[PDB]
From a paper:
Among the 15 apo [name] structures determined in this study, the highest resolution data set (1.5 Å) was selected for full refinement and validation and for PDB deposition. These crystals belonged to space group P212121, with a calculated Matthews coefficient of 2.33 Å3 Da−1 (solvent content 47.3%) and one [name] molecule occupying the asymmetric unit. Excellent electron densities throughout most of the Fab chains allowed model building of residues Met2–Pro215 of the H chain and Ser2–Pro212 of the L chain, except for H-chain residues belonging to loop Ser130–Ser134 and to the terminal TEV cleavage site of the H chain (Lys216–Gln228). Disappointingly, none of the electron-density maps calculated from these data sets revealed the presence of bound [name] or fragments thereof. Instead, for crystals obtained by the in situ proteolysis experiments, the slow growth of these crystals (∼60 d) suggests that extensive proteolysis might have taken place, resulting in the dissociation of [name] and thus the crystallization of apo Fab [name] only. In summary, the structures of apo Fab [name] are highly isomorphous, although they were obtained from crystals obtained under different crystallization conditions, which include pH values ranging from 4.2 to 6.5. The binding affinities were also measured for [name] sequence variants p3 (long variant) and p20 (short variant), showing that Fabs 12E1 and [name] recognize all variants tested with high binding affinity, except for NHBAp20, for which no binding by Fab [name] was detected. Moreover, the lack of recognition of [name] by NHBAp20 might be owing to unfavourable electrostatic interactions, as the slight sequence differences between NHBAp2 (243-KSEFEKLSDADKISNYKKDG-262) and NHBAp20 (180-KSEFENLNESERIEKYKKDG-199) in the putative epitope region might result in a different electrostatic potential distribution on the antigen surface.
Residue numbers in the entry:
A (entry chain H): 1 to 128, 134 to 214
B (entry chain L): 6 to 216
Write the structure that this text describes.
């Protein structure tokens, strides 16, 4: 019924990471678990299997020697530790249930980079059919993602937050635009709320004519 | 990926398409626990076939699976637009070991052509005050999902400072993309205008902004 994975991790080369996968809504010890990763734009790659009732493990030749898979039956949680991290370990890591891999967690992003996390700079995109487009430019953050809301979630109609661009700086930018009535400009207040969890930052920006 | 899949397959609604997963007599030819997974963009994989031919409850009947020789095959009999996804096979090869195929991207054709909508923003006062300048070109609601973007300073091609996304599918099954142009405040003030020119299926449309 549920596999819920831990939050995204940002690590330097040579460091270690340990991610987790909490099971619920089924009998934990009745099914083994797998770890499967997926590098950006690439295919699924099986990392290993860990039993929840007999102590056995088996790992992909590729990560043998620097992976450890364990379980904690007190909380129905599986753990995967990966050591001596390299840049191309950067991937989304999934846990999956059982011998056919019938249910998957939502994934944990691991970014391995010499660059540090960086929160965004936010700029207003002022408004110029009876409607106007206004928005927020979310510049130069790392890694993904950012989320954007408008007026703390009170404004939802007509919002389009676009996929990010990865720039030649190695940082990301995106924009969020909302289409509103032109008559509203200067009597309604518009504020974008930008969240960048990797840097533990939140930014509010008022967008005025 | 010790199992080989075609990088891409395509067809039109109602057609049948088969995606192959090819190994050797030592793996696919010797073992029977073949799974297939359907993965929407930005989503976890979903199991849609297990043990070569069985469908998990709820998976549409048009998905079926077979195996012959050293190839396992996923067949979609009567394609629908909602079937667009990446598909993966996997195989259990004893000794607690699983192996995946490389993945296949499935395209379902037949959506009508839709020209892009373009919104272009100039640099903000605030960014200029920070001695930076970004032009923002937002491109939406187009199909098929490919565009090229060129920028002009007055009428001359812009050769530096451009960043453009790959198109991605929107929730309405049309596509979106963004292009950004980085300038100095001095470059932005010094020209009469800048334009974002978007080319879609041979047709070029545009927006222009001026300081």
């Amino acid at each position: 019924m549920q596999l819920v994975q831990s939050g995204a991790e940002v690590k330097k080369p040579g460091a270690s990471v340990k991610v987790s996968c909490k099971a619920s809504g089924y009998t934990f010890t009745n099914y083994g678990l797998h770890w499967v990763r997926q590098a950006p734009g690439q295919g699924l790659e099986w990392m290993g299997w860990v039993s929840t009732n007999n102590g056995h493990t088996n790992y992909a030749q590729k990560v043998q020697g620097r992976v450890t898979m364990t379980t904690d039956t007190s909380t129905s949680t599986a753990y995967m530790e990966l050591r001596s991290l390299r840049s191309d370990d950067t991937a989304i890591y999934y846990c999956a249930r059982g011998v056919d891999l019938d249910y998957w967690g939502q994934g944990t992003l691991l970014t391995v980079s010499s660059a540090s996390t960086k929160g965004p700079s936010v700029f207003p995109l002022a408004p110029s059919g009876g409607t106007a487009a206004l928005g927020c430019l979310v510049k130069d953050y790392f890694p993904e993602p950012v989320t954007v809301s408008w007026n703390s979630g009170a404004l939802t109609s007509g919002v389009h937050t676009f996929p990010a661009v990865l720039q030649s700086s190695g940082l990301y930018s995106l924009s969020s635009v909302v289409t509103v009535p032109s008559s509203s400009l200067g009597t309604q207040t518009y504020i974008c709320n930008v969240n960048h969890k990797p840097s533990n930052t939140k930014v509010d920006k008022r967008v005025e004519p | 990926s010790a199992l080989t899949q075609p990088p891409s397959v395509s067809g039109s609604p109602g057609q049948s398409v088969t995606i192959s997963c090819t190994g050797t007599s030592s793996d696919v030819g010797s073992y029977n626990r073949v799974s297939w997974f359907q993965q929407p963009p930005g989503t976890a994989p979903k199991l849609i076939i297990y043990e070569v031919s069985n469908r998990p409850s709820g998976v549409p009947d048009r998905f079926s699976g077979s195996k012959s020789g050293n190839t396992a095959s996923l067949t979609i009999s009567g394609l629908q637009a909602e079937d667009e996804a990446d598909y993966y096979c996997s195989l259990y090869i004893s000794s607690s070991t699983w192996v995946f195929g490389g993945g296949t991207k499935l395209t379902v054709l037949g959506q009508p052509k839709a020209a892009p909508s373009v919104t272009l923003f100039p640099p903000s006062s605030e960014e200029l005050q920070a001695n930076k300048a970004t032009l923002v070109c937002l491109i939406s609601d187009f199909y098929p999902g490919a565009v090229t973007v060129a920028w002009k300073a007055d009428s001359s091609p812009v050769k530096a400072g451009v960043e453009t996304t790959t198109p991605s599918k929107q929730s309405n099954n049309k596509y979106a993309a963004s292009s950004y142009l980085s300038l100095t405040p001095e470059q932005w003030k010094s020209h009469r205008s800048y334009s974002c020119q978007v080319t879609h299926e041979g047709s070029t449309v545009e927006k222009t902004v001026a300081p």
